[PDB]
Ligand binder design. Structure first.
Ligand SMILES: *[C@@H]1O[C@H](CO)[C@@H](O[C@@H]2O[C@H](CO)[C@@H](O[C@@H]3O[C@H](CO)[C@@H](O)[C@H](O)[C@@H]3O)[C@H](O)[C@H]2NC(C)=O)[C@H](O)[C@H]1NC(C)=O
Ligand SMILES: *[C@@H]1O[C@H](CO)[C@@H](O)[C@H](O)[C@H]1NC(C)=O
Lengths: 50, 51, 115, 50
């Protein structure tokens, strides 16, 4: 905004809220979001499960 | 997947660079150079051990 | 309409049926591809030199730097004047010629060159 | 949801809109009449809802 810098090549999704006051190039790559979670142990003692 | 967002390059108001960096961006893409640059940096090779 | 002019240091590029009037209802693509690090110099030869007093649509020869309809617009030429020679290093000058439903003209003659 | 997907699932032809449901789980909101020409003249497909 303040022009103290120039074109800033950095990870930044082309979002409308930014786009309203920011000029943006064409996407060099796409982007998505998703669940990221550990692999569940899913283990029951079983020796005294009953 | 949830949303299809797009990774672009920031640039200030009316800067002449957008209109001519995109042609570079497209040029880098269409020739495949992006894929290799994609490949060369996401070549993390730890495999998913089968479950 | 397609005259695949790929891989030439230079070659002829022209509207269909050039010495005659171009056919109507024709929307045919042309593509100029340059090898890496090269420069494209497009030579354009007008058939008829007059000065129009107006600019209009329905018959327009635009020039694009990159893939069509998706790269920035360079300029959109029409009429009977000769467009000025275009020098860019975008390496992809891809040019489309359109046609309305009538009102054909003298067509155009061009010459692509690579350096 | 469709705008969230935005050609993730926005299919262009009816007949190949069928096979998207034939090959996986899909909804493909399509008009009543063409349904009757398909669901009656093809198996594995049902009119759902009203
Ligand atoms: C005297 O001779 C001149 C040519 O040297 C005649 O000039 C023509 O003038 C008209 C306007 O009356 C021009 O149309 C205008 O063109 C400009 C530039 O494209 C455009 O911005 C305007 O909106 C308008 O379209 C015309 O181009 C110009 N040239 C031609 C084709 O002859 C002039 O008319 C003559 N004097 C008279 C009153 O007859
Ligand atoms: C239902 O699906 C099966 C498997 O693709 C197919 O063989 C069958 O022809 C389909 N139903 C009919 C009778 O069209």
């Amino acid at each position: 905004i303040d022009h103290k810098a120039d074109l800033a090549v950095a990870p930044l999704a082309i979002t409308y809220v930014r786009e309203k006051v920011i000029d943006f190039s064409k996407p060099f790559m796409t982007l998505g979001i998703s669940i990221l979670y550990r692999k569940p142990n899913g283990t029951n003692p079983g020796v005294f499960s009953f | 997947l949830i949303d299809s967002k797009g990774y672009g390059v920031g640039t200030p108001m009316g800067s002449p660079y957008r209109d001519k960096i995109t042609i570079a961006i497209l040029q880098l893409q269409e020739e495949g150079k992006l894929h290799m640059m994609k490949e060369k940096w996401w070549r993390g090779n730890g495999c998913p051990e089968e479950e | 309409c397609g005259i695949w002019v790929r891989t030439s240091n230079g070659g002829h590029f022209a509207s269909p049926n050039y010495p005659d009037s171009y056919p109507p209802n024709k929307e045919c693509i042309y593509i100029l591809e340059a090898a890496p690090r090269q420069r494209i110099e497009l030579t354009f030869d007008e058939r008829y030199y007059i000065e129009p007093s107006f600019e209009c649509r329905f018959d327009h020869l635009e020039v694009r730097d990159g893939p069509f309809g998706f790269s920035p617009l360079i300029d959109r030429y029409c009429g009977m004047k000769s467009p000025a020679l275009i020098r860019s290093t975008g390496r992809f000058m891809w040019i489309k010629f359109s046609s309305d439903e009538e009102l054909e003209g003298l067509g155009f003659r061009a010459k692509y060159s690579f350096i | 949801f469709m705008s969230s997907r935005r050609q993730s699932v926005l299919v262009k032809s009816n007949e190949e809109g069928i096979q998207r449901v034939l090959t996986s789980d899909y909804a493909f909101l399509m008009e009543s009449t063409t349904i009757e020409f398909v669901t009656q003249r093809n198996c594995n497909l049902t009119q759902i809802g009203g």
